[PDB]
Short mmCIF file of C-alpha atoms in Angstrom, two decimals:
data_model
loop_
_atom_site.label_atom_id
_atom_site.label_comp_id
_atom_site.label_asym_id
_atom_site.label_seq_id
_atom_site.Cartn_x
_atom_site.Cartn_y
_atom_site.Cartn_z
CA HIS A 483 -22.42 -9.94 -0.29
CA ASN A 484 -20.22 -7.31 -2.00
CA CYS A 485 -20.03 -7.74 -5.79
CA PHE A 486 -19.25 -5.56 -8.82
CA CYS A 487 -21.23 -4.42 -11.85
CA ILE A 488 -20.95 -4.60 -15.62
CA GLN A 489 -22.50 -1.59 -17.36
CA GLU A 490 -23.29 -1.51 -21.09
CA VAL A 491 -21.63 1.56 -22.62
CA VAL A 492 -22.16 0.94 -26.35
CA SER A 493 -23.11 -1.83 -28.81
CA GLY A 494 -22.89 -2.71 -32.51
CA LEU A 495 -19.15 -3.38 -32.84
CA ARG A 496 -17.42 -5.65 -35.39
CA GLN A 497 -15.55 -8.12 -33.15
CA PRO A 498 -13.97 -5.86 -30.52
CA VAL A 499 -10.44 -6.95 -29.55
CA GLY A 500 -9.58 -4.22 -27.04
CA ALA A 501 -9.80 -0.54 -26.10
CA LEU A 502 -7.32 2.11 -24.94
CA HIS A 503 -6.82 5.85 -24.58
CA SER A 504 -4.33 8.24 -26.21
CA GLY A 505 -2.93 9.95 -23.08
CA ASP A 506 -3.41 13.46 -24.44
CA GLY A 507 -5.91 15.10 -22.08
CA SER A 508 -8.84 14.36 -24.37
CA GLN A 509 -10.83 11.42 -23.04
CA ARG A 510 -11.22 9.48 -26.27
CA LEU A 511 -11.56 5.72 -26.08
CA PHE A 512 -10.09 3.95 -29.09
CA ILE A 513 -11.88 0.67 -29.73
CA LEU A 514 -10.15 -1.85 -31.97
CA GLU A 515 -12.19 -4.09 -34.25
CA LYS A 516 -10.54 -7.37 -35.25
CA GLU A 517 -11.22 -6.81 -38.96
CA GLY A 518 -8.69 -3.94 -39.02
CA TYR A 519 -10.73 -1.02 -37.72
CA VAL A 520 -10.13 1.49 -34.94
CA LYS A 521 -13.20 3.43 -33.75
CA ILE A 522 -13.27 6.50 -31.48
CA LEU A 523 -15.58 6.86 -28.48
CA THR A 524 -16.07 10.49 -27.40
CA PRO A 525 -16.44 11.12 -23.63
CA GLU A 526 -19.97 12.31 -24.48
CA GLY A 527 -20.73 8.84 -25.84
CA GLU A 528 -20.66 8.80 -29.66
CA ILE A 529 -18.89 6.51 -32.09
CA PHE A 530 -17.66 8.91 -34.80
CA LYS A 531 -19.00 7.78 -38.20
CA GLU A 532 -15.54 7.82 -39.81
CA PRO A 533 -13.04 5.40 -38.20
CA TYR A 534 -9.77 6.58 -36.67
CA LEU A 535 -7.92 3.85 -38.56
CA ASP A 536 -9.17 1.77 -41.49
CA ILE A 537 -6.45 -0.63 -42.63
CA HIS A 538 -9.19 -2.81 -44.07
CA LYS A 539 -7.67 -4.52 -47.15
CA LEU A 540 -4.28 -5.03 -45.48
CA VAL A 541 -5.44 -7.58 -42.87
CA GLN A 542 -6.88 -11.08 -43.30
CA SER A 543 -8.99 -11.43 -40.15
CA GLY A 544 -10.17 -14.64 -38.47
CA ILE A 545 -13.41 -16.09 -39.84
CA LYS A 546 -14.85 -18.32 -37.07
CA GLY A 547 -13.65 -20.70 -34.34
CA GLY A 548 -10.27 -20.64 -32.58
CA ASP A 549 -8.77 -18.21 -35.10
CA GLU A 550 -6.56 -15.29 -34.06
CA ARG A 551 -5.61 -13.66 -37.36
CA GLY A 552 -7.09 -10.12 -37.31
CA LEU A 553 -5.70 -6.88 -35.84
CA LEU A 554 -3.89 -7.54 -32.56
CA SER A 555 -2.77 -4.49 -30.60
CA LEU A 556 -2.32 -0.71 -30.66
CA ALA A 557 -0.06 1.55 -28.65
CA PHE A 558 0.20 5.35 -28.61
CA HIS A 559 3.58 7.02 -28.10
CA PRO A 560 3.99 8.47 -24.59
CA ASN A 561 4.37 11.85 -26.31
CA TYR A 562 1.50 11.32 -28.78
CA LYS A 563 0.11 14.78 -27.93
CA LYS A 564 3.19 16.29 -29.61
CA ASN A 565 4.24 13.66 -32.18
CA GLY A 566 0.95 11.96 -33.12
CA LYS A 567 2.62 8.54 -33.23
CA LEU A 568 0.78 5.22 -33.27
CA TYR A 569 2.07 1.67 -33.28
CA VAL A 570 -0.12 -1.15 -34.54
CA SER A 571 0.36 -4.91 -34.74
CA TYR A 572 -1.69 -6.82 -37.36
CA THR A 573 -1.56 -9.86 -39.68
CA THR A 574 -1.25 -9.54 -43.46
CA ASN A 575 -1.64 -12.04 -46.30
CA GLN A 576 0.08 -9.62 -48.67
CA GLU A 577 3.82 -10.15 -49.19
CA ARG A 578 6.14 -11.88 -51.69
CA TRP A 579 8.80 -13.11 -49.27
CA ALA A 580 10.83 -16.01 -50.72
CA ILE A 581 10.70 -17.91 -47.40
CA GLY A 582 8.75 -20.91 -48.73
CA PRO A 583 5.75 -22.51 -46.95
CA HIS A 584 4.15 -20.17 -44.40
CA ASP A 585 0.68 -18.90 -43.45
CA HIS A 586 1.15 -15.13 -42.96
CA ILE A 587 3.50 -12.49 -41.53
CA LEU A 588 3.01 -10.56 -38.28
CA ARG A 589 3.80 -6.93 -38.89
CA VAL A 590 4.55 -4.12 -36.44
CA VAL A 591 4.03 -0.68 -37.94
CA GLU A 592 4.07 2.92 -36.81
CA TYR A 593 1.64 5.56 -38.05
CA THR A 594 0.97 9.28 -37.69
CA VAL A 595 -2.25 11.35 -37.45
CA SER A 596 -3.12 13.65 -40.34
CA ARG A 597 -2.12 17.23 -39.49
CA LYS A 598 -5.47 18.43 -40.88
CA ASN A 599 -7.55 16.01 -38.76
CA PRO A 600 -7.02 14.92 -35.12
CA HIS A 601 -9.65 12.16 -35.38
CA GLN A 602 -8.09 10.19 -38.25
CA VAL A 603 -4.63 8.96 -39.31
CA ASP A 604 -3.02 9.27 -42.75
CA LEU A 605 -2.08 5.92 -44.24
CA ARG A 606 0.93 7.39 -46.07
CA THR A 607 2.95 7.65 -42.83
CA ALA A 608 3.07 3.85 -42.37
CA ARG A 609 6.56 2.65 -41.40
CA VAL A 610 7.22 -1.05 -40.91
CA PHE A 611 9.38 -1.78 -37.86
CA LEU A 612 9.10 -5.57 -37.93
CA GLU A 613 7.72 -8.45 -39.94
CA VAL A 614 7.55 -11.93 -38.43
CA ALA A 615 6.82 -15.05 -40.48
CA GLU A 616 4.03 -17.24 -39.16
CA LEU A 617 3.19 -20.86 -39.89
CA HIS A 618 -0.09 -21.20 -37.99
CA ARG A 619 -3.07 -19.11 -36.86
CA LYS A 620 -2.76 -19.53 -33.08
CA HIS A 621 -0.30 -18.61 -30.29
CA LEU A 622 0.51 -15.31 -32.02
CA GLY A 623 0.55 -12.75 -29.24
CA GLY A 624 0.94 -9.25 -30.67
CA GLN A 625 0.21 -7.11 -27.60
CA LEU A 626 2.13 -3.79 -27.68
CA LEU A 627 2.88 -1.38 -24.82
CA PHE A 628 5.12 1.43 -23.62
CA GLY A 629 6.80 1.07 -20.25
CA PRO A 630 7.30 3.92 -17.75
CA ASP A 631 10.89 3.64 -19.04
CA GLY A 632 9.71 4.84 -22.48
CA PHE A 633 10.54 1.66 -24.42
CA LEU A 634 8.20 -0.33 -26.64
CA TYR A 635 7.45 -3.90 -25.58
CA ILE A 636 6.09 -6.41 -28.05
CA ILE A 637 4.76 -9.63 -26.58
CA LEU A 638 4.91 -12.42 -29.15
CA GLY A 639 3.44 -15.89 -28.74
CA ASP A 640 4.68 -19.35 -29.71
CA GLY A 641 3.10 -19.57 -33.16
CA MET A 642 3.10 -23.33 -32.48
CA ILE A 643 6.51 -23.35 -34.20
CA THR A 644 8.35 -26.58 -33.42
CA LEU A 645 12.15 -27.02 -33.41
CA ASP A 646 11.41 -28.89 -36.61
CA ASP A 647 10.49 -26.21 -39.19
CA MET A 648 12.79 -23.98 -37.11
CA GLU A 649 15.97 -25.54 -38.54
CA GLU A 650 14.22 -27.04 -41.59
CA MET A 651 14.13 -23.49 -43.02
CA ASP A 652 16.35 -20.72 -44.28
CA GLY A 653 15.28 -19.22 -40.99
CA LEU A 654 12.35 -17.12 -39.86
CA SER A 655 11.00 -15.36 -36.77
CA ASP A 656 13.38 -16.27 -33.89
CA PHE A 657 11.55 -13.34 -32.26
CA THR A 658 8.62 -15.67 -31.52
CA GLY A 659 7.78 -16.68 -27.93
CA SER A 660 9.67 -13.63 -26.63
CA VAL A 661 9.00 -10.24 -25.13
CA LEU A 662 10.85 -7.71 -27.29
CA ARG A 663 12.12 -4.37 -26.01
CA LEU A 664 12.73 -1.50 -28.41
CA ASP A 665 13.80 2.13 -28.10
CA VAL A 666 11.72 3.98 -30.70
CA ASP A 667 13.17 7.40 -29.87
CA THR A 668 15.97 7.42 -32.49
CA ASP A 669 17.98 10.19 -34.14
CA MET A 670 19.58 7.67 -36.51
CA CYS A 671 17.80 7.24 -39.85
CA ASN A 672 19.67 4.01 -40.62
CA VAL A 673 17.06 2.05 -38.61
CA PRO A 674 13.36 2.18 -37.59
CA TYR A 675 14.32 1.59 -33.93
CA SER A 676 17.24 1.58 -31.50
CA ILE A 677 18.21 -1.21 -29.08
CA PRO A 678 18.11 -0.19 -25.39
CA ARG A 679 21.67 -0.14 -24.04
CA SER A 680 20.39 -2.03 -20.97
CA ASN A 681 18.74 -4.85 -22.98
CA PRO A 682 20.75 -8.04 -22.65
CA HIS A 683 22.40 -9.17 -25.91
CA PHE A 684 23.11 -5.47 -26.63
CA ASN A 685 26.39 -6.50 -28.29
CA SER A 686 26.90 -10.31 -28.38
CA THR A 687 25.91 -10.92 -32.01
CA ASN A 688 24.79 -14.54 -31.64
CA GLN A 689 21.57 -13.95 -29.69
CA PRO A 690 19.01 -11.36 -30.92
CA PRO A 691 19.42 -7.91 -29.27
CA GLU A 692 15.65 -7.22 -29.48
CA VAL A 693 14.84 -10.22 -27.25
CA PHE A 694 14.39 -9.11 -23.65
CA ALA A 695 12.95 -12.41 -22.35
CA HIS A 696 11.58 -15.66 -23.82
CA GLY A 697 9.56 -18.74 -22.78
CA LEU A 698 6.08 -17.59 -23.84
CA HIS A 699 3.68 -20.04 -25.53
CA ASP A 700 0.04 -18.86 -25.90
CA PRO A 701 -0.21 -15.61 -23.91
CA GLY A 702 -3.55 -13.98 -23.27
CA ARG A 703 -4.00 -10.25 -22.97
CA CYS A 704 -1.25 -9.65 -20.39
CA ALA A 705 -1.86 -7.47 -17.33
CA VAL A 706 0.44 -4.43 -17.26
CA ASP A 707 1.27 -2.86 -13.87
CA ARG A 708 2.84 0.63 -14.09
CA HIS A 709 2.91 1.25 -10.34
CA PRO A 710 4.05 -2.12 -8.97
CA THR A 711 3.53 -2.42 -5.24
CA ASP A 712 7.14 -3.69 -4.86
CA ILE A 713 9.25 -0.48 -4.70
CA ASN A 714 12.14 -2.38 -6.32
CA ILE A 715 10.16 -3.06 -9.51
CA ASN A 716 8.93 -0.31 -11.83
CA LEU A 717 7.07 -2.36 -14.45
CA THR A 718 5.36 -5.73 -14.19
CA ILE A 719 3.78 -7.67 -16.97
CA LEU A 720 1.89 -10.79 -15.89
CA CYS A 721 0.58 -13.18 -18.54
CA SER A 722 -1.83 -16.08 -18.54
CA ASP A 723 -0.33 -18.73 -20.77
CA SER A 724 -2.64 -21.38 -22.22
CA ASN A 725 0.31 -23.80 -22.62
CA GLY A 726 -1.78 -25.57 -25.27
CA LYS A 727 -2.51 -28.75 -23.31
CA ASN A 728 -4.86 -26.86 -20.91
CA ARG A 729 -2.04 -26.82 -18.33
CA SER A 730 -2.74 -23.09 -17.88
CA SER A 731 -0.13 -21.06 -15.99
CA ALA A 732 0.78 -17.48 -15.06
CA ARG A 733 4.13 -16.09 -16.16
CA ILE A 734 5.38 -12.90 -14.54
CA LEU A 735 8.04 -10.52 -15.89
CA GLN A 736 9.61 -7.89 -13.64
CA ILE A 737 11.54 -4.92 -15.04
CA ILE A 738 13.99 -3.19 -12.68
CA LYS A 739 14.71 0.54 -12.95
CA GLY A 740 18.18 1.57 -14.09
CA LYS A 741 19.69 -1.90 -14.16
CA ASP A 742 22.04 -2.99 -16.91
CA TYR A 743 20.80 -6.51 -17.64
CA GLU A 744 23.57 -9.14 -17.61
CA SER A 745 21.31 -11.78 -19.17
CA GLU A 746 17.52 -12.07 -19.68
CA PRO A 747 15.27 -12.07 -16.64
CA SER A 748 13.47 -15.38 -16.08
CA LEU A 749 9.80 -15.55 -17.00
CA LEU A 750 8.82 -16.63 -13.49
CA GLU A 751 6.09 -19.27 -13.78
CA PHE A 752 3.47 -20.48 -11.31
CA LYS A 753 0.08 -22.27 -11.39
CA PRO A 754 -2.61 -20.43 -9.38
CA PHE A 755 -5.46 -21.43 -11.72
CA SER A 756 -7.66 -24.41 -10.90
CA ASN A 757 -9.18 -24.90 -14.37
CA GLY A 758 -9.58 -23.50 -17.89
CA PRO A 759 -7.83 -20.98 -20.17
CA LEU A 760 -8.33 -17.26 -19.61
CA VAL A 761 -8.75 -14.49 -22.16
CA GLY A 762 -6.29 -12.39 -20.14
CA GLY A 763 -5.96 -9.84 -17.36
CA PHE A 764 -5.55 -6.24 -16.29
CA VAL A 765 -4.39 -4.41 -13.17
CA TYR A 766 -6.97 -1.92 -11.93
CA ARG A 767 -5.45 1.45 -11.07
CA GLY A 768 -8.58 3.59 -11.42
CA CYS A 769 -10.35 6.21 -9.35
CA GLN A 770 -13.96 4.96 -9.23
CA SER A 771 -13.20 1.93 -7.03
CA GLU A 772 -11.18 2.20 -3.84
CA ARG A 773 -11.32 -1.47 -2.84
CA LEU A 774 -10.48 -2.86 -6.31
CA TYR A 775 -7.36 -0.69 -6.61
CA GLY A 776 -4.28 -2.83 -7.14
CA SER A 777 -6.03 -6.09 -7.97
CA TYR A 778 -4.78 -8.13 -10.92
CA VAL A 779 -8.09 -9.07 -12.56
CA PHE A 780 -8.25 -12.10 -14.88
CA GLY A 781 -11.17 -13.49 -16.90
CA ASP A 782 -12.20 -16.39 -19.14
CA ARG A 783 -14.36 -16.63 -22.26
CA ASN A 784 -17.59 -17.34 -20.39
CA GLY A 785 -17.28 -14.49 -17.87
CA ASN A 786 -15.76 -15.92 -14.70
CA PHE A 787 -13.34 -13.50 -13.02
CA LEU A 788 -10.41 -13.76 -10.58
CA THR A 789 -8.15 -11.65 -8.37
CA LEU A 790 -4.56 -12.34 -7.29
CA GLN A 791 -4.11 -16.91 -4.53
CA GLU A 792 -7.03 -16.69 -7.00
CA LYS A 793 -10.15 -15.01 -5.55
CA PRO A 794 -13.36 -14.91 -7.65
CA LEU A 795 -15.16 -11.71 -8.66
CA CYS A 796 -18.92 -12.01 -8.42
CA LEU A 797 -21.01 -9.54 -10.41
CA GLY A 798 -24.26 -9.52 -8.43
CA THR A 799 -27.19 -8.67 -10.71
CA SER A 800 -28.86 -7.28 -7.54
CA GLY A 801 -31.62 -4.67 -7.96
CA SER A 802 -30.73 -3.21 -11.35
CA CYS A 803 -26.93 -3.34 -11.11
CA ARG A 804 -26.59 -6.26 -13.55
CA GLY A 805 -23.76 -8.78 -13.98
CA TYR A 806 -24.70 -10.75 -17.09
CA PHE A 807 -23.53 -10.06 -20.64
CA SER A 808 -24.05 -11.34 -24.19
CA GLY A 809 -21.78 -13.91 -25.88
CA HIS A 810 -18.22 -14.45 -24.70
CA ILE A 811 -15.45 -12.07 -23.66
CA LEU A 812 -12.92 -11.16 -26.36
CA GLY A 813 -10.75 -8.46 -24.74
CA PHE A 814 -10.31 -5.68 -22.18
CA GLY A 815 -10.03 -1.88 -22.04
CA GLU A 816 -8.81 1.15 -20.10
CA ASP A 817 -9.92 4.79 -19.64
CA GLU A 818 -7.66 7.81 -19.53
CA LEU A 819 -9.17 8.03 -16.04
CA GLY A 820 -8.03 4.50 -15.20
CA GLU A 821 -11.46 2.90 -15.40
CA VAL A 822 -11.57 -0.58 -16.91
CA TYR A 823 -13.74 -2.18 -19.60
CA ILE A 824 -14.64 -5.60 -20.98
CA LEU A 825 -15.42 -6.28 -24.65
CA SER A 826 -17.63 -9.14 -25.88
CA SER A 827 -19.52 -10.14 -29.05
CA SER A 828 -22.17 -12.81 -29.79
CA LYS A 829 -21.17 -14.35 -33.15
CA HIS A 830 -22.61 -7.79 -36.49
CA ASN A 831 -23.26 -6.51 -32.91
CA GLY A 832 -20.37 -6.22 -30.44
CA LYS A 833 -20.73 -4.80 -26.93
CA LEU A 834 -18.63 -2.64 -24.59
CA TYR A 835 -19.09 -3.02 -20.84
CA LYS A 836 -17.66 -0.71 -18.19
CA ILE A 837 -16.85 -2.00 -14.71
CA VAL A 838 -18.49 -0.20 -11.77
CA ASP A 839 -18.08 -0.47 -7.98
CA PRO A 840 -21.65 -0.03 -6.62
CA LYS A 841 -20.32 1.01 -3.20
CA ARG A 842 -18.84 4.16 -4.81
CA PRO A 843 -20.47 6.94 -6.93
CA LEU A 844 -20.73 6.44 -10.69
CA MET A 845 -18.91 9.72 -11.34
CA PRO A 846 -17.14 10.67 -8.05
CA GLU A 847 -15.92 14.23 -7.31
CA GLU A 848 -12.19 13.40 -6.97
CA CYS A 849 -12.30 11.47 -10.26
CA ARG A 850 -13.33 14.41 -12.45
CA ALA A 851 -10.89 15.48 -15.12
CA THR A 852 -11.59 18.67 -17.03
CA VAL A 853 -11.57 17.55 -20.67
CA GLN A 854 -8.94 18.90 -23.09
CA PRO A 855 -10.31 18.81 -26.67
CA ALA A 856 -7.78 17.14 -29.01
CA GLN A 857 -5.60 19.44 -31.13
CA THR A 858 -3.66 19.47 -34.41
CA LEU A 859 0.13 18.94 -34.30
CA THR A 860 2.34 22.05 -34.23
CA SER A 861 5.87 20.57 -34.15
CA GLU A 862 8.75 21.75 -36.35
CA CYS A 863 9.16 18.35 -38.04
CA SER A 864 5.48 18.71 -38.88
CA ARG A 865 4.41 21.24 -41.57
CA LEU A 866 8.11 21.69 -42.52
CA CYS A 867 9.70 18.26 -43.07
CA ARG A 868 8.66 17.20 -46.57
CA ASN A 869 9.96 14.17 -48.52
CA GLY A 870 10.92 11.57 -45.91
CA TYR A 871 9.90 10.54 -42.41
CA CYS A 872 9.71 12.25 -39.06
CA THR A 873 11.12 10.49 -35.93
CA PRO A 874 9.27 10.33 -32.56
CA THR A 875 11.88 12.83 -31.27
CA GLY A 876 11.24 15.25 -34.16
CA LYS A 877 14.39 14.57 -36.21
CA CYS A 878 13.47 14.79 -39.89
CA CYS A 879 14.90 11.86 -41.87
CA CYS A 880 15.31 11.98 -45.66
CA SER A 881 14.13 9.53 -48.30
CA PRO A 882 17.00 8.66 -50.73
CA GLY A 883 18.08 11.53 -52.99
CA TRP A 884 17.16 14.32 -50.56
CA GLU A 885 19.27 16.26 -48.06
CA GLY A 886 19.26 19.35 -45.84
CA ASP A 887 17.61 19.99 -42.47
CA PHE A 888 14.09 19.23 -43.74
CA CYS A 889 14.98 17.26 -46.91
CA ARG A 890 14.20 20.37 -48.97
CA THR A 891 17.16 20.28 -51.37
CA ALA A 892 17.40 17.53 -54.01
CA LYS A 893 20.49 15.38 -54.63
CA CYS A 894 21.94 14.56 -58.06
CA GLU A 895 24.69 11.92 -57.77
CA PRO A 896 25.91 12.12 -61.37
CA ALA A 897 25.92 15.98 -60.97
CA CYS A 898 23.96 18.43 -63.18
CA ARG A 899 26.11 20.56 -65.52
CA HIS A 900 25.88 23.57 -67.88
CA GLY A 901 23.79 25.69 -65.50
CA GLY A 902 21.33 22.83 -64.96
CA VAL A 903 19.23 22.59 -61.81
CA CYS A 904 18.67 19.47 -59.72
CA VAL A 905 14.92 19.42 -59.01
CA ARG A 906 14.19 15.85 -57.83
CA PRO A 907 16.60 13.00 -56.98
CA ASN A 908 18.62 12.49 -60.18
CA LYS A 909 15.93 14.41 -62.08
CA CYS A 910 17.53 17.42 -63.72
CA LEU A 911 16.15 20.49 -65.53
CA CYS A 912 18.37 21.78 -68.35
CA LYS A 913 18.46 25.24 -69.93
CA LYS A 914 17.45 25.39 -73.61
CA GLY A 915 19.97 23.80 -75.98
CA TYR A 916 21.19 21.12 -73.57
CA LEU A 917 20.14 17.46 -73.45
CA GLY A 918 20.82 14.30 -71.42
CA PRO A 919 20.12 13.33 -67.77
CA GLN A 920 22.86 15.74 -66.63
CA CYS A 921 22.56 18.22 -69.55
CA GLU A 922 25.89 16.82 -70.78
CA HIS A 923 25.28 16.94 -74.57
CA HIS A 924 25.06 20.07 -76.73
#
């Protein structure tokens, strides 16, 4: 019969959680390691010695078992090629919040690539967007993505947070179990992000404006469809929810183009799975396989695959085109060419497997993309905007006590006198003979 093939691309990874591309012409594959590493895979086939991101000490990763505490997701800005903007979701043990009893906080942070190195990011550019208190080490979610509408979606799990401990607290979270929707493209320096005008709860200040839809418990890696087959819909995220009590179910969320949402869409739930919890899914929109195109592909820990109503995917080890892998499946991946990957470790050594349709060429003629080697940023907010941050749109925002177009001039709120010069915020250089923080005493 007609099966597919898993092909070993590279090995020796430290608990691979997922893989994605940057959407910038270069065909780099960014592999995320649970411990708080991001590693680059060149289209030639190397893993660059130096990691793209090493937020090592910041994250307390999961030791062994049913843990879920490492690095969670990564998303590149749709305009990354011009603004070098990352977004990362991870778990940190390092805060002094006066919340009381809690396990950790789930942080969502943006970053920027170093202007003097396209293959590594500078840790100074870190900007927290969100921090979410957590009580347990399961049902966390964390998956990040950008819709074809340009907004950032954060998919957050249950956290196993009961209604007890919800009220029994000077609150926390209330973003948990929801899909958030954020407009990152802001010109306003008052906030890290803007609320989409079409989000429900845009005004009504009694429900959170960031919450686009709720009802999620333990979501897997959710399948994200950017070309939904239903003309009416323009983005579809479909999640496998573990539900906890093995009552596994699929929840589907449909985003409609140019519609001002009255209230939240319903997380439409159905049960097409016969048994067992899945790691997650992906929608294949690649070039290498004609017949797979469009199929929502879901998989479990052991390596059993489905297609949406569930139709199994055999991986016939026929001839030399294998179908067996080592250990269990941990996450999934995507090419800049649309080709899909599976990641699995044994429990050092982590593997990366590409999916291949044996009925079609390995590297087919119409699938070729002429590679564009990655480049340093050239934007005006780059190499000019000093002292303060630099929005995804290019608007240079100033850290307190700086003003001007590029935060070049320094502010002095008590005002420097006697021919004094304001050099840094409230710092003040006086001409000989004058003393005091504003040169006020002679």
